[PDB]
Design a binder for this molecule. Structure first.
Ligand SMILES: [Mg+2]
Ligand SMILES: [Mg+2]
Ligand SMILES: [Mg+2]
Ligand SMILES: [Mg+2]
Ligand SMILES: [Mg+2]
Ligand SMILES: [Mg+2]
Ligand SMILES: [Mg+2]
Ligand SMILES: [Mg+2]
Ligand SMILES: [Mg+2]
Ligand SMILES: [Mg+2]
Ligand SMILES: [Mg+2]
Ligand SMILES: [Mg+2]
Ligand SMILES: [Mg+2]
Ligand SMILES: [Mg+2]
Ligand SMILES: [Mg+2]
Ligand SMILES: [Mg+2]
Ligand SMILES: [Mg+2]
Ligand SMILES: [Mg+2]
Ligand SMILES: [Mg+2]
Ligand SMILES: [Mg+2]
Ligand SMILES: [Mg+2]
Ligand SMILES: [Mg+2]
Ligand SMILES: [Mg+2]
Ligand SMILES: [Mg+2]
Ligand SMILES: [Mg+2]
Ligand SMILES: [Mg+2]
Ligand SMILES: [Mg+2]
Ligand SMILES: [Mg+2]
Ligand SMILES: [Mg+2]
Ligand SMILES: [Mg+2]
Ligand SMILES: [Mg+2]
Ligand SMILES: [Mg+2]
Ligand SMILES: [Mg+2]
Ligand SMILES: [Mg+2]
Ligand SMILES: [Mg+2]
Ligand SMILES: [Mg+2]
Ligand SMILES: [Mg+2]
Ligand SMILES: [Mg+2]
Ligand SMILES: [Mg+2]
Ligand SMILES: [Mg+2]
Ligand SMILES: [Mg+2]
Lengths: 64, 77, 41
RNA sequence: GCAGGUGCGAAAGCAGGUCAUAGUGAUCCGGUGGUUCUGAAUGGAAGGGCCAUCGCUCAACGGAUAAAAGGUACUCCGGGGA
RNA sequence: AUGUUCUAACGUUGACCCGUAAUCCGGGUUGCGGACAGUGUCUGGUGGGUAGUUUGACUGGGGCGGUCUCCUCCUAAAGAGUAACGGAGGAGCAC
RNA sequence: UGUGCAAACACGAAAGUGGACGUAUACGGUGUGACGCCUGCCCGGUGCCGGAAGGUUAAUUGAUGGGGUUAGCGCAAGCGAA
RNA sequence: CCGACUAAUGUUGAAAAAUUAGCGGAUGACUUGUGGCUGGGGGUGAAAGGCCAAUCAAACCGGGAGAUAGCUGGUUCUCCC
RNA sequence: UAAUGGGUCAGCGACUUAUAUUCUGUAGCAAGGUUAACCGAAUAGGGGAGCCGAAGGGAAACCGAGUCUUAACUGGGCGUU
RNA sequence: UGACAGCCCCGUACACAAAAAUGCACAUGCUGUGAGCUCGAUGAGUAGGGCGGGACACGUGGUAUCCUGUCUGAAUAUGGG
RNA sequence: AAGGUGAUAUGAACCGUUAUAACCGGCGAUUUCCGAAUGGGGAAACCCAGUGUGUUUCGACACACUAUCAUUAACUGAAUCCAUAGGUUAAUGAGGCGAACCGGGGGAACUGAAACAUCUAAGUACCCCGAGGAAAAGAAAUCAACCGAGAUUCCCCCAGUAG
């Protein structure tokens, strides 16, 4: 039968132009008063999935 | 059987649900009561096993109409 | 329950009067005792 | 270092916390404020997103549940001379 | 609302009659209860009576004891890193 | 220690049946274990029994406040009955 | 007749619990024939978790069923890098 | 090795199958490729419903060889050759 | 068929066949069900609601819609989903 | 149709060759006993009846009938005055079996989640009821989106997308 997408993965990764995946940074959900403005600022933009984790992400998202 | 003779209401099944959402099978029984119904046209009391809802139906439609339905249905009384 | 008295009933009223009684009063007394009839007409 | 706005200094300048290195908790689910970005016929709205922020001695501290102690000499299986 | 009285729903595993040749059942007559009891739905309590399960890891065997995240020094062999239930101290803030 | 008889209790979704064609000198449950001499103190804990003033408390009911929508008032901002 | 305290034998037995010598009850809460009833989280138990067809801390048969097995075993012709 | 398994022989006995997905090889066609069900006597032919590809950025509206970030980039992320 | 047969045999292509029963498909006789037509009528303990469940891909969630065990309860065509 | 009386399977005794030998087909006849089993009973293949008829040679004998429930009739007929309940008789129908498919009433757990309770397995397995040759569904109080479609059912997509 058709492979089933890991739905939670589809809610956290989007495929980019050259086949990589973008994701939102962790650590910007809650307790934030104690975190420096610089640290939170650098967590705001999306980042690319690293080479080690690309295999896991690709396995989870066959239909990306 | 626990069946309303007017409406046909019978036990149905469902679940108890706990706060933790544990489901356990259960039944819902009709609110049945054996009642003596005066039939003025027949000068007779007729006893029926009826739900409270069927009691209200008899109140709304008259005992003669309901007894006619029961006869048409084969339901003895 | 709205009934039609077929006779004078104490606190209720007089023959012809159409009144509202508790369904139990009507079903188990007034009607079986010919003292009233349901208001259908 | 760049843009905006600022403090101290006459000025050159210094300042994006503290001599430095511990003082901490992912994600989910939700709460509060802001922002028409979205708005299932359409206009709204609800809900969602985005930005800011809040709720864990999850301390077994990469946190398996929201939620969990014991007995077996009545015992049982799969394994190990790890 | 809470009493009391009532009878007609409802109960009767009181009596008597009939179906009937029957200690079932049903129908009648009557007495006693009587809007109570009982049952349905919903709901608080109780509930090893019963059920499904959980009851960590490291460890010079397991258990008991200790430990589990973070910081500083030494072990560490003059770059970095480097283990032991090795040797010594601290943090879970303050402003 | 329970049980006033349609007994308590037990088997049974129920009807019923056992208890018993017995009725508190009876029946069930529990512990103790012929007989002799005996069986002391503690009711704070847990249970059971009784109480019922006061605190707390379910379903149910839905006062009151806030919001969405919009007839309309408006030029717009807006306000805003049912 | 009903049992089963001790010992020896037997232990691929003559026997999947017996034989032999002894042993206990033997008018009783005794023992026996025939038939009947109680059914598996159920029965029955003068209570050993005993017994319920040589099976019992949940009988047996069939089915879910190829349960699951981070464990053990095993995994079959050839040559070259 | 005094750890496991095999008394011996013969016969049987363990990486399959279906579908989806990616990569390699090979073949066809090529900025295009290819059809499914179905139709059809048709392994033909028809059927282009669709699917994948030639565009990306952004959460999104949207913009677009750019786009997002920000009041704005000297910029920076993802893309474009 | 004594080894491998177009021509030995039984078949095969092809061409035929039913006293009787029966399937179907036509056809018109008996027969009941009754066409077209105007006026009119238009499904109530129901829709909807409160409580508990269940069904909807949709686990109560901001959750529409469906079903109903329980308690209620309309408009009805100018009306209603 | 010149052969034939099924097989193991010879034999025996026969039948037949122009058409009543055998063989094949249609329609019929016969069709013990048990079994729904139906007259009652029962440890299936048995035990024991009651009614009618008919027969007897007087010993007896043969045959048909007699279950239950539903519905419909006729007659009857309580407590109880009408009546009803009830009782009997007759007619019509049902009953039981069967592999799958179908609709409905109930409905698991192992298992997966690397533990486990929400969740999963799965409305699956199983039990039960009912039907037909198919069943079910079906002629919009349906969708759509301001353009339109036009009952149900099945197939390919949409799409492992929206959720
Ligand atoms: Mg946030
Ligand atoms: Mg300082
Ligand atoms: Mg310091
Ligand atoms: Mg809208
Ligand atoms: Mg850890
Ligand atoms: Mg962990
Ligand atoms: Mg073992
Ligand atoms: Mg070993
Ligand atoms: Mg060793
Ligand atoms: Mg337990
Ligand atoms: Mg389990
Ligand atoms: Mg350990
Ligand atoms: Mg140790
Ligand atoms: Mg060093
Ligand atoms: Mg060195
Ligand atoms: Mg190393
Ligand atoms: Mg009794
Ligand atoms: Mg003792
Ligand atoms: Mg014994
Ligand atoms: Mg002896
Ligand atoms: Mg003695
Ligand atoms: Mg003696
Ligand atoms: Mg013991
Ligand atoms: Mg045994
Ligand atoms: Mg068990
Ligand atoms: Mg299974
Ligand atoms: Mg297995
Ligand atoms: Mg050796
Ligand atoms: Mg060896
Ligand atoms: Mg060996
Ligand atoms: Mg794009
Ligand atoms: Mg040869
Ligand atoms: Mg209508
Ligand atoms: Mg409703
Ligand atoms: Mg609603
Ligand atoms: Mg509706
Ligand atoms: Mg019989
Ligand atoms: Mg018979
Ligand atoms: Mg008999
Ligand atoms: Mg598991
Ligand atoms: Mg049909």
């Amino acid at each position: 039968p058709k492979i089933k997408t890991v739905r939670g993965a589809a809610k956290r990764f989007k495929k980019t132009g050259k086949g990589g995946f973008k994701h939102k940074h962790a650590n910007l959900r809650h307790i934030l008063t104690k975190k420096a403005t610089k640290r939170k600022r650098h967590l705001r933009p999306k980042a690319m999935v690293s080479k080690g984790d690309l295999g896991l992400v690709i396995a989870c998202l066959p239909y990306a | 059987s626990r069946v309303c003779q007017v409406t046909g209401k019978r036990p149905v099944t469902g679940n108890n649900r706990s706060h933790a959402l544990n489901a356990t099978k259960r039944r819902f029984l009709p609110n049945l009561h054996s009642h003596r119904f005066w039939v003025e046209s027949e000068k007779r009391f007729v006893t029926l096993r009826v739900s409270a809802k069927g009691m209200r139906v008899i109140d709304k439609k008259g005992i003669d109409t309901v007894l006619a339905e029961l006869r048409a249905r084969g339901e003895k009384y | 329950m709205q009934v039609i008295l077929l006779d004078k009933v104490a606190n209720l009223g007089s023959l012809g009067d159409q009144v509202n009684v508790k369904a139990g009063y009507a079903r188990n007394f007034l009607v079986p005792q010919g003292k009233a009839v349901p208001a259908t007409k």
